[PDB]
Design an enzyme around this catalytic site. Structure first.
Site, PDB file in Angstrom:
ATOM      1  N   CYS A 126       9.679  15.009  15.120  1.00  0.00           N
ATOM      2  CA  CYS A 126      10.435  15.565  16.220  1.00  0.00           C
ATOM      3  C   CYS A 126       9.554  16.501  17.042  1.00  0.00           C
ATOM      4  O   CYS A 126       9.984  17.524  17.602  1.00  0.00           O
ATOM      5  CB  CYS A 126      11.698  16.319  15.763  1.00  0.00           C
ATOM      6  SG  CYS A 126      12.939  15.262  15.093  1.00  0.00           S
TER       7      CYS A 126
ATOM      8  N   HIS B 209       9.369  21.953  18.340  1.00  0.00           N
ATOM      9  CA  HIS B 209      10.255  20.892  17.898  1.00  0.00           C
ATOM     10  C   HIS B 209      11.127  20.433  19.073  1.00  0.00           C
ATOM     11  O   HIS B 209      11.431  21.212  19.976  1.00  0.00           O
ATOM     12  CB  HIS B 209      11.074  21.460  16.733  1.00  0.00           C
ATOM     13  CG  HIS B 209      12.026  20.509  16.087  1.00  0.00           C
ATOM     14  ND1 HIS B 209      13.112  19.973  16.745  1.00  0.00           N
ATOM     15  CD2 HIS B 209      12.105  20.072  14.807  1.00  0.00           C
ATOM     16  CE1 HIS B 209      13.795  19.211  15.906  1.00  0.00           C
ATOM     17  NE2 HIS B 209      13.210  19.265  14.723  1.00  0.00           N
TER      18      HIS B 209
ATOM     19  N   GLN C 111      11.901  27.232  10.505  1.00  0.00           N
ATOM     20  CA  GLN C 111      10.902  27.118   9.445  1.00  0.00           C
ATOM     21  C   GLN C 111      10.395  28.468   8.957  1.00  0.00           C
ATOM     22  O   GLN C 111       9.405  28.510   8.223  1.00  0.00           O
ATOM     23  CB  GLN C 111       9.700  26.284   9.908  1.00  0.00           C
ATOM     24  CG  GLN C 111       9.996  24.830  10.158  1.00  0.00           C
ATOM     25  CD  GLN C 111      10.443  24.098   8.890  1.00  0.00           C
ATOM     26  OE1 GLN C 111      10.216  24.568   7.760  1.00  0.00           O
ATOM     27  NE2 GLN C 111      11.079  22.944   9.074  1.00  0.00           N
TER      28      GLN C 111
ATOM     29  N   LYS D 264      17.883  23.929   5.629  1.00  0.00           N
ATOM     30  CA  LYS D 264      16.502  24.283   5.305  1.00  0.00           C
ATOM     31  C   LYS D 264      16.403  25.507   4.416  1.00  0.00           C
ATOM     32  O   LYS D 264      15.347  25.736   3.814  1.00  0.00           O
ATOM     33  CB  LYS D 264      15.701  24.580   6.564  1.00  0.00           C
ATOM     34  CG  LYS D 264      14.920  23.447   7.074  1.00  0.00           C
ATOM     35  CD  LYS D 264      15.772  22.614   7.920  1.00  0.00           C
ATOM     36  CE  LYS D 264      14.887  21.887   8.846  1.00  0.00           C
ATOM     37  NZ  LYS D 264      14.338  22.961   9.662  1.00  0.00           N
TER      38      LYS D 264
ATOM     39  N   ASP E   9      12.841  30.169  17.752  1.00  0.00           N
ATOM     40  CA  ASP E   9      13.275  29.106  16.847  1.00  0.00           C
ATOM     41  C   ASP E   9      12.703  29.427  15.472  1.00  0.00           C
ATOM     42  O   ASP E   9      11.511  29.212  15.219  1.00  0.00           O
ATOM     43  CB  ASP E   9      12.816  27.744  17.358  1.00  0.00           C
ATOM     44  CG  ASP E   9      13.084  26.614  16.363  1.00  0.00           C
ATOM     45  OD1 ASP E   9      13.533  26.890  15.216  1.00  0.00           O
ATOM     46  OD2 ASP E   9      12.825  25.441  16.731  1.00  0.00           O
TER      47      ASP E   9
END
Ligand SMILES: Cc1ncc(COP(=O)(O)O)c(C=O)c1O
Ligand SMILES: Cc1ncc(COP(=O)(O)O)c(C=O)c1O
Lengths: 405, 405
Positions: A363, A122, A202, A225, A199
């Site tokens: 993104c 991302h 998600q 999220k 990261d």
């Protein structure tokens, strides 16, 4: 086991109507809807306990400070950090990565060094590293992609050398749903004395996450999220690294003393990295979101989302000229294009049917370019979505094809 | 005219009980309570309209994006900016000042230059400038204080020279309630080609503010002091300055294109300075807070708060050994110490009576040091406080004196 109908009953937006039709919200990967427990925990705090939180002497402020530090403790357990004081409150994954890139990056990445990212990252996990490399004169290296949406792990020996300071890597791709082999990659990066930032934006809503087992040095994710409020995220840093990092933002509540003649000194870390009034409301709501998810059980969520995904992938086989991107074991998202039609149009028809998907580059322009498309559609299949919403999507793609083909 | 009883009826926290007694919240300068209109506007958004806001194609996301840009327009009118695109959404006054200090400061303050602050500044308007001076090798100059809490304006000729790049100055002191003569100081600073950043965190809730009339180059303030949600603030920058500033945080929604081989390019300004998902919930609540305040009328608020302050200052004359700090025309706050008793103790007794004041250094240690005390007490007198709460404070100080003297 798991009752999707009982879950959906907590989410007031899910009964909304869009364009005169009942909403099928398939865009949780961009942001998740929130349950009443989260919405009301925030509202209730504002209604009965609100105060400034810099360990004020009076009761409301003292109690507010304690609620915030309890949420920090709860979050540390959620990801199995060793210590609450290893978590920093940030505006989201993006601010957390920029904080690492400036605070740790500026005093640990010198001219002639290299940093490694992957081609599926991302933008939040690209641009801050591009900026850092430009500031200090280092090189940004990239792990390339296979056609099925996995990393070309065989290139690692040519990218890792003794000047590699940092691997910045995604846990789960927001486009492909690929889950990366973090534990093994971290082992490798540590052999070279490189740190790893993960990261996890998600990942934390789909299955348990254990930063001690991963042994990552930095881990970031976003409240909104995780079925939680906007404006809040978590940055986790190994205690020994965090105690060494200099401050980034300066101001109140991160100083020990401020002098106009003797200069200023900093407080201890985690608070050294939280300048000004925090987003107390968002921190309260984040705590409630963590309790809500924990109460359902991340393993029960994972099992239901797995079935829903397996069902969708099988039903989508009956859509002519559908192109899918990513591995068959994808988590969370389905990235696709429909025949030669532009994703923008597919998404507009789906919206006209009341189905909310995201179209665009997500993104992730380097990812779009690897597949030689300008855009994709992405359907999110979250814990509160249903087989019937999957059926509406399939029918929709079929009608869009008949009508526009 | 103004009905404090009707106002108080909007603030659910004001009926709270602390320590078994009815709360008298006199700490709004640290953070303000919020009305139902603000609390429910946020909750209602989460309940019925929530979505990601990066001009998504589907309805909820498209409508969410429009709500956010409408709040930007509303905020620009609230302070009479020329253009909505002159306002940047930030986490608060503190993030806004750090954004200016890094983005504008790093490419406009060179070694050998100087920056001017005042001795009454909040830490948020000191530390970022100390950090900038350390990065680029410039000098931080200070306007000193008079005993009555006003600036020694006669020192300006010795502080302003042709190497002065920036005046960073508070509109209203969070401790003294001094209001500084911004319009004249800005005229002077512009004669030398220096920019002016105004810290307006304690101004925007007490009377109208007009950045075009002030002609300031940067103006910042915080939502949560303006009866609004936490985690949100406004940075205003003159369009011509803002179009030149480079990005600070990097990531999604502030790029034009991201390439791993050709580098990355930035989008236009205001969005260039807003990386990642914004605090959409806080932006909604901020909009409602602006509507609520506008509906009461800032001039009606100013008139009521003036009377309340005049009443308190007269009643406090009957407290033995009370020391007050600041001018007689103070806005908003009363800073004091009681005889020789430490402020910490005074505040603890006041809290035990159900009166919430703030004690400590108030994120203004240079100010504390000028007065040669380590701490003060500060009572906030906001639009929802009453003569009776002033009477409870006066009685309290009297009992604290009788008992501890
Ligand atoms: C004058 C002044 N500046 C700065 C701040 C800090 O702003 P925030 O904590 O909302 O970032 C406050 C509070 C204040 O009163
Ligand atoms: C993998 C990934 N990284 C980063 C982000 C951005 O995080 P945020 O917009 O909440 O700051 C997202 C969303 C994401 O899915």
């Amino acid at each position: 086991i798991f009752s999707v109908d009982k879950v959906r009953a907590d989410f007031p937006v899910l009964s909304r109507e869009v364009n005169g039709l009942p909403l099928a919200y398939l865009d949780s990967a961009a942001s998740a809807q929130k349950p009443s427990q989260v919405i009301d925990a925030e509202a209730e705090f504002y209604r009965h306990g609100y105060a400034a939180v810099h360990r004020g002497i009076h009761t409301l402020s003292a109690q507010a400070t304690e609620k915030m530090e309890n949420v920090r403790k709860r979050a540390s357990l959620f990801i199995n950090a060793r210590s609450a004081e290893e978590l920093v409150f940030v505006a989201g994954t993006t601010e957390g990565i920029n904080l690492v890139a400036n605070s740790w990056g500026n005093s640990n990445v010198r001219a002639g060094d290299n940093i490694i990212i992957s081609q599926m990252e991302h933008h939040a996990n690209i641009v801050p590293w591009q900026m850092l490399c430009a500031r200090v004169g280092a090189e940004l290296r990239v792990i390339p992609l296979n056609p099925d949406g996995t990393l070309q792990l065989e290139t690692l020996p040519t990218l890792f050398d003794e000047k590699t300071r940092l691997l910045a890597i995604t846990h789960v791709s927001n486009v492909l749903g690929t889950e990366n082999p973090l534990a093994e990659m971290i082992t490798l990066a540590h052999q070279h004395g490189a740190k790893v930032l993960v990261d996890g934006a998600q990942a934390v809503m789909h299955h348990p996450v254990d930063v001690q087992a991963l042994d990552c040095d930095f881990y970031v994710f976003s409240g909104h999220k995780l079925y939680g409020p906007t404006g809040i995220g978590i940055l986790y840093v190994k205690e020994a690294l965090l105690q060494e990092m200099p401050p980034w933002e300066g101001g109140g509540s991160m100083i020990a003393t401020v002098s106009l003649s003797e200069g200023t000194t900093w407080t201890k870390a985690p608070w050294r990295f939280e300048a000004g009034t925090p987003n107390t409301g968002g921190i309260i709501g984040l705590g409630a979101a963590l309790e809500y998810v924990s109460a359902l059980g991340l393993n029960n969520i994972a099992e239901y989302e797995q079935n829903l995904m397996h069902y969708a992938l099988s039903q989508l086989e009956s859509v002519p000229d559908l192109t899918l991107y990513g591995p068959q074991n994808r988590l969370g998202v389905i990235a696709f294009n429909l025949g030669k039609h532009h994703a923008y149009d597919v998404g507009s028809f789906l919206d006209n049917y009341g189905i909310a998907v995201r179209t665009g580059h997500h993104c992730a322009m380097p990812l779009m370019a690897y597949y030689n498309v300008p855009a994709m559609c992405r359907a999110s299949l979250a814990m509160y979505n249903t087989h019937e919403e999957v059926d509406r999507l399939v029918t929709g793609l079929q009608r869009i094809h008949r009508l526009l083909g």
